[PDB]
């Protein structure tokens, strides 16, 4: 379903998978919240994938 994993090459970026029909906006909202709560050394970015990649 929804997955979250570190970016292979970008320590400051994570990868998020959002399956079809899922509320992307709600997923983003969470990411923006937690993205700032902690945060890496650099700027916190996420890559959003459309569809279940499992």
């Amino acid at each position: 379903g929804i997955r979250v994993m570190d970016h292979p090459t970008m320590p400051d970026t994570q990868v998020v998978v959002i399956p079809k029909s899922a509320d992307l906006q709600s997923v983003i909202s969470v990411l923006t919240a937690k993205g700032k709560e902690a945060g890496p050394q650099g700027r916190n970015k996420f890559i959003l994938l459309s569809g279940d990649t499992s």
Binding site: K36, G39, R43, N44, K45, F46, I47, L48, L49, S50
Partner: peptide, 25 residues
């Protein structure tokens, strides 16, 4: 992200900037 321009967007998926709370398409 596609190289060859300043506007290095993705060819697939989106980039979420959680520092400026803005989604780049």
């Amino acid at each position: 992200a596609q190289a060859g321009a300043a506007n290095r967007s993705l060819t697939e998926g989106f980039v979420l900037d959680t520092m400026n709370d803005s989604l780049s398409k």
